[PDB]
């Protein structure tokens, strides 16, 4: 018994830390999300103004979006937790086989197998889930940004230099910040009402 | 007893509270209930879009 | 009236998780001296039971 | 008597401890019964809203609600009281038969 | 705890509520919603020119 | 929430630590008054088998 | 016997409880569960971290 | 904007640095009453082991 109120209670710390990584890469998926707000605003008012702005004024927003762009590399990478780049997309991708995974598994009972699994894949270069970076668009819409001067040369039915890829890039892309921020507040869930079980059980 | 008191329980709920205090805290300081977590998943995902 | 959309998932009944507030304060002040209770009991069996 | 004192008293010992262990599990499935409280509200939340929310809305919650899941296999199944996955519901199920109970 | 306490959140919220009215401010003062920095960029150097 | 990862590990449930503060204070002062009883009880071995 | 008594123990007990008590008072007093000790290496390491 | 230089050297966070004030002043309150207790246990070692 004593085995198990001390391996629980360890546990609960355990947890706790679990919640405390959770919450770091949760907090820092909000950032790029509301920074991909602001890109959908330069989306729109990069919509060459229709035609009415010019590739000089384009050009500045592109540096605008230049800039944000790397500080979604920065959400992307700065995420060291505990030395973790958690949100290196490459750290837990499925890859449709176990070559590489590394599992990001939690440890919650004080008996063997009572592990939790999670999955953490956002990156900078991560947008339209094709498969993967399709090709200069669904993934480098984010990164490159086709409204150089390619979005001037047409805004509708080139579908990869008319706007429609493009905000379509920005669409999903925030959409996969939000399903996986999804997936960590369930896990948040989970680690609370285990707590709650292992702190009443093992009272 | 002199080896484990009985009042552990209370340590619980006086946790549960601070998780709640401190929760309703959160929401009060940034005026809202949308959590930073992924806690209301689809009212944060249909927000966000 | 979007905007009225976002309000209702994102807004705070300000009144209503004040009174969940003081609520969970009263009930984390509360079992705080029930704490103190019961790590005070045993003092009398070591001063009166011996 | 000295007899009936004695096993008596270690009775007491022994009625104690299954008031140990019923405890123990009661306490965990008032976990399991709270988890499943926030299960209706994501099911009337799971409404669709009606029709008003997505399928990738939809998929996220349903994200949720396969990690409350595996909590919920998770208190019938961690509740190892002195190795006893008391609250394996394969371990005293009535059968319709003496066959194992 | 005694050693953290955790709302600095709201410090971050407050921060950033500072930012918010600083800036409504900055526009109500000058009667500008153009940004003297290079925010809107485009909007600035079209009603420039 | 770095720094709640950096409370979780150096942060203390100071209801916790007062409890098995007085909980092993308690057992401080009860084998003291042990030690007393087995440092008195000879005595009458001197002074009632002699 | 009147050569050596058999509460010992009680000696043994008592010391343990004053690394008890004590060690609790540390805590407390620092308001820290941390130990200076690497007691709690892998926590110490990661929190200075 | 030099101005708004020379503010984030020497500007306070009043709110942050208020925290840390009762933040050091609870650790300042605590540790004294540690010291009573450290400075009040021998006493049952000459009252009752005496």
């Known amino acids: ?203 | 007893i002199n080896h484990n008191i009985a009042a552990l329980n209370t340590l619980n709920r006086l946790s549960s509270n601070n998780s709640a205090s401190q929760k309703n805290m959160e929401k009060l300081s940034s005026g809202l209930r949308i959590n930073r977590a992924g806690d209301d998943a689809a009212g944060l995902a249909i927000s966000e879009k | ?50």
Do not use: W
């Not at chain 1, 480098?140 to 039915?157: E, G, I, P, Q, R």
């Not at chain 1, 080139?158 to 960590?184: H, M, P, T, W, Y």
């Open chain 1, 1 to 203: 018994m004593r085995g198990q109120i001390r391996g629980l209670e360890m546990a609960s710390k355990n947890s706790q830390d679990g919640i405390s990584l959770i919450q770091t890469a949760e907090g820092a998926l909000t950032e790029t999300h509301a920074i991909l707000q602001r890109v959908r605003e330069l989306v729109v008012q990069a919509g060459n103004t229709g035609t009415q702005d010019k590739a000089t004024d384009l050009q500045s927003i592109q540096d605008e979006i230049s800039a944000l762009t790397d500080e979604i590399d920065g959400i992307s990478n700065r995420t060291e937790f505990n030395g973790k780049k958690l949100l290196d997309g490459t750290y837990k991708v499925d890859t449709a086989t176990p070559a590489n995974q590394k599992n990001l598994v939690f440890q919650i009972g004080a008996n063997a197998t009572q592990q939790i699994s999670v999955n953490i894949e956002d990156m900078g270069a991560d947008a339209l889930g094709i498969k993967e970076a399709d090709g200069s668009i669904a993934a480098l819409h984010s990164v490159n940004d086709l409204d150089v001067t390619k979005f001037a040369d047409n805004a509708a039915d080139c579908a990869d230099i008319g706007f429609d890829a493009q905000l379509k890039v920005v669409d999903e892309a925030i959409n996969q910040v939000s399903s996986q921020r999804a997936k960590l507040g369930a896990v948040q869930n989970r680690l609370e009402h285990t707590i709650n079980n292992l702190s009443a059980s093992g009272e």
């Open chain 3, 1 to 50: 009236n979007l905007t009225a959309a976002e309000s209702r998932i994102r807004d705070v009944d300000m009144a209503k998780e004040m009174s969940e507030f003081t609520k969970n304060n009263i009930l984390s002040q509360a079992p705080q001296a029930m704490l103190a209770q019961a790590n005070q009991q045993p003092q009398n069996v070591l001063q009166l039971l011996r």
